[PDB]
Design a protein around this ligand. Structure first.
Ligand SMILES: [Mg+2]
Ligand SMILES: [Mg+2]
Ligand SMILES: [Mg+2]
Ligand SMILES: [Mg+2]
Ligand SMILES: [Mg+2]
Ligand SMILES: [Mg+2]
Lengths: 42, 54, 88, 95, 114, 274, 52
RNA sequence: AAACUUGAGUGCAGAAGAGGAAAGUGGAAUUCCAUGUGUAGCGGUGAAAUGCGCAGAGAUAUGGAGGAACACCAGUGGCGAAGGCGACUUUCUGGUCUGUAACUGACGCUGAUGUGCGAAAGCGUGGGGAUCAAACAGGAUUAGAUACCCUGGUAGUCCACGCCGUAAACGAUGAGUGCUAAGUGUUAGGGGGUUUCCGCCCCUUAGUGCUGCAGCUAACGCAUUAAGCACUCCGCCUGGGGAGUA
């Protein structure tokens, strides 16, 4: 989980780092939360 | 000619092995024969000369 | 519509000479039979809208022949209004 | 001017002159208002293909009518539903 | 009552159910997959039909109805594995019918599943 | 079936009447009438025992037979007439025997129509015949509850009941209430639904049409003093201030069931009201 | 509805497995597992006909 | 002011059709009820639970009631101006196509304003209410829910009469008439040629598709069903938001 901000405010920039962090975790989880696939064996 | 709905023997070679209709793809009849057939096969279903299912 | 023995009957009075069907006043009279036949059907069947533009089209083909018939002889037009009842 | 071909089915569990009493009311109905029956052919017992009013057999009838009114055969449609013997019925115009 | 009957199976997409009865159906005995300790979603297996068929057939015992002429009434995974496992009981399966309810486009089925 | 009144007046405004198109003769039959004085809520002691009854319009009582006795004698219908004493219309039927009498007019009933009231009757609208001989599934009305007493059940306008099944000497039936009851099999019930279907849909639209019906006005309990009603006076408008709404005589009136149990027909009710 | 006798059960199945596949039962109830929209089956039948 | 027959229309003779409207008839399935027999679960899911059942559930068999649709035939098929139209029968009724040439003799085309049809969802007055199902209730999932999933469920879905008049109402393509390589399926005819023991082949007409020159296009692509070459008439556009809003 990487993210970068090139702001100078080291309190307002982390308001955007946590925004980019929270987006990337949801990409990771919905990648692996497609276990729910109805596959009935023969 | 014209299919009469009482002539069962020529009309029941076109019914299925359960009571369905064979398509003209597998039977091989023409277009206007098939739909002149199907208005006679369904008047014969109504007066119990042929079943709906067996 | 109307039967042929009804249709061949109505082309006897308004015929101009023998074997002249297709004349304007012999194909307005058979329209007025077909006008009056279908709006009696349409009177008891008020929901039949697809048969209504069949009526409204042959109203238009009767009007275009009445407007045609005045343009070459007016005295024949006055006789057809009196023979079978139309307004205008 | 119009050629009709009715076909009506009666119960199997009826006896002889009960059967021929019911066919002779209808051929008077199918002669009413200028109907003038061509002929009244009768099929025999047929093993009919399924189970209507939990019966197994039926006695068929074929009556051909030449009318121009449709006054006789809809009268037939009115009464054949009323009677509990005549189990199905179908008129069809042939052109 | 001895050695004459009708076997009814209807394996749906869950829970293969079997009821054996006489030739004029009066429910001689029945068993299911839930009656064998299969709680849920293991019931939609042919292996559930491997035991559920004979445990109603062999535990009938009231008349010795030992012929079946089975009837199939459901689209399921354990469909043909319930008649294959019926000759494990060995009850002379002599007439197999697929009598399933097929509509003539009669009613509105439920919604699509997203 | 129903006419709406144009709002020419505030009291005529939303009022909705009933045009009497099913009525064919607007005059009663002089030999089947009977005086009906009003007992406006007052019993033999002289005092008012049910509230909200008073002086409506004067009414004659038309004797109609709820028991249907004349077996196997046909009855043509003269006319469909108005009756003030019930929600339905009534039908003057005339026997081929010669005697005239009224029955409640069913839904589709026309003049010149024959009516048979016996056991060998065809299952047609208006014919009365015992519940043994009535086939299962048909709708039926004017139901006897005891053999010979006359029909009592499903008798107001638009009421019907369908025969559900047959026990040993009982038939099952489903009421217009929704209640499934066993009725004794040797009891009459006339085939069909009783007419005047649009009776429920009149907006009487006016405080005076209610008074012409004989309905005196109902003062609420919460606008009384606390010796007139248990919801008697607070200061200003008050909520009802008790655990339950209560009647003028101190019984809880909202929800509480008042059917007297340990009763003989408790064996006969199968399903409750729906 | 076909009776199969004078053999074992593992050969009556071979008749019955193809006496059901040549019938409108399994392909019919799989179609009516859920209501399809009245203009998407006209394309579903069109895809099941243009491919043949 | 006359004359003509091709355009347009009527005849005559053949067809094809889920074109409408009204009234009847029919079968399978769904739900509910009544009954027989019979015993522990049924149902449901990625897994469960809510829910249902010992006041006999489900399963099975017979019978009943009721509403809604019409499996198979069924097809880049048919019909209609469009919306649309799919059990069957009868009545009433509209249009198209083919062929013949008897007849009328430009009667034609387009069409502002106007006047009528117009999917669904809606609204009104009543009916009817079987399945399905917004809203709503409850159980799970998840990181989180008001979503997805599951159980249940009201309006609605259905009919009758009045409205509403909007859709990605789409071939994102107005109508009419000519003209311009071909190849190929298929539908409704017609004339031939063999003859077939009812099956082909060639030519032509009107539909309906798929390929593809010339030509066109900004490019995709279109191409005798033009988006090619022309002529008539009608609707409409002239930057994006603001806005189909005051
Ligand atoms: Mg009161
Ligand atoms: Mg008022
Ligand atoms: Mg009050
Ligand atoms: Mg006071
Ligand atoms: Mg007190
Ligand atoms: Mg108080």
């Amino acid at each position: 989980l990487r993210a970068e901000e090139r702001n100078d405010d080291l309190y307002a920039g982390i308001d955007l780092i946590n925004n980019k962090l929270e987006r990337q975790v949801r990409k990771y989880k919905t990648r692996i939360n497609r276990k729910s696939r109805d596959r009935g064996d023969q | 000619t014209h299919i009469d709905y009482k002539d069962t023997e020529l009309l029941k070679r076109f019914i299925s092995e359960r009571g369905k209709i064979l398509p003209r793809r597998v039977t091989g009849t023409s277009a206007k024969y098939q739909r002149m057939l199907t208005t006679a096969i369904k008047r014969s279903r109504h007066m119990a000369l042929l079943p709906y299912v067996k | 519509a109307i039967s042929q023995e009804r249709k061949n009957e109505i082309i006897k009075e308004y015929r101009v000479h023998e074997t002249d069907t297709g004349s304007p006043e012999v194909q307005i009279a058979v329209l007025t039979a077909e006008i009056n036949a279908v709006n009696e059907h349409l009177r008891t069947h008020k929901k039949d809208h697809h048969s209504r533009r069949g009526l409204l089209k042959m109203v238009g083909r009767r009007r275009h022949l009445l407007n045609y018939l005045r343009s070459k002889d007016i005295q024949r037009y006055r006789e057809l209004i009196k023979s079978l009842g139309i307004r205008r | 001017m119009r050629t009709y071909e009715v076909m009506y089915i009666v119960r199997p569990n009826i006896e002889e002159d009960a059967k021929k009493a019911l066919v002779e009311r209808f051929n008077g109905i199918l002669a009413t208002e200028g109907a003038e029956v061509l002929e009244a052919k009768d099929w025999g017992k047929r093993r009919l293909a399924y189970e209507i009013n939990d019966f197994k057999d039926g006695f068929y009838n074929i009556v051909r009518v030449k009318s121009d009114n449709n006054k006789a055969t809809d009268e037939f449609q009115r009464l054949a539903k009323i009677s509990d013997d005549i189990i199905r019925y179908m008129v069809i115009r042939e052109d | 009552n001895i050695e004459n009957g009708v076997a009814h199976i209807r394996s749906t997409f869950n829970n293969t159910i079997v009821t054996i009865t006489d030739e004029f159906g009066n429910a001689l005995s029945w068993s299911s997959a839930g009656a064998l300790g299969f709680k849920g979603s293991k019931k939609s297996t042919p292996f559930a039909a491997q035991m559920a068929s004979e445990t109603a057939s062999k535990s009938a015992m009231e008349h010795g109805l030992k012929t079946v002429e089975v009837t199939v009434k459901g689209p399921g995974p354990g469909r043909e594995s319930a008649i294959r496992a019926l000759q494990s009981a060995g009850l002379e399966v002599t007439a197999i019918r697929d009598v399933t309810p097929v509509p003539h486009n009669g009613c509105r089925p439920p919604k699509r599943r997203r | 079936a129903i006419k709406k009144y144009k709002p020419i007046t505030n009291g005529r405004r939303n009022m909705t009447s009933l045009d009497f198109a099913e009525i064919t003769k607007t005059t009663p039959e002089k030999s089947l009438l009977k005086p009906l004085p009003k007992k406006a809520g007052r019993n033999n002691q002289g005092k008012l025992t049910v509230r909200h009854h008073g002086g409506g319009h004067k009414r004659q009582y038309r004797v109609i037979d709820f028991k249907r006795n004349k077996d196997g004698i046909n009855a043509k219908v003269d006319s469909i007439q108005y009756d003030p004493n019930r929600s339905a219309n009534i039908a003057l039927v005339v026997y081929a025997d010669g005697e005239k009498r009224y029955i409640i007019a069913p839904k589709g009933l026309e003049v010149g129509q024959i009516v048979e009231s016996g056991a060998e009757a065809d299952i047609k609208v208006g014919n009365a015949l015992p519940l043994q001989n009535i086939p299962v599934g048909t709708v039926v009305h004017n139901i006897e509850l005891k053999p010979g007493k006359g029909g009592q059940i499903a008798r107001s306008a638009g009421a019907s009941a369908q025969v559900l099944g047959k026990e040993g000497k009982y038939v099952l039936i489903r009421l217009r209430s929704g209640e499934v009851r066993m009725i004794l099999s040797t009891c009459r019930a006339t085939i069909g639904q009783v007419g005047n279907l649009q009776h429920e849909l009149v907006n009487v639209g006016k405080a005076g049409r209610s008074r012409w019906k004989g309905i005196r006005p109902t003062v609420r309990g919460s606008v009384m003093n606390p010796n007139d009603h248990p919801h008697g006076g607070g200061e200003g408008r008050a909520p009802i201030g008790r655990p339950s709404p209560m009647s003028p005589w101190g019984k809880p009136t909202l929800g509480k069931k008042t059917r007297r149990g340990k009763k003989s027909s408790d064996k006969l009710i199968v399903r409750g009201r729906k | 509805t076909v009776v199969r006798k004078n053999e074992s059960l593992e050969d009556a199945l071979r008749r019955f497995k193809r006496s059901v596949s040549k019938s409108g039962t399994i392909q019919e109830v799989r179609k009516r597992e859920f209501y399809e929209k009245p203009s998407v089956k006209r394309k579903k039948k069109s895809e099941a006909a243009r491919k043949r």
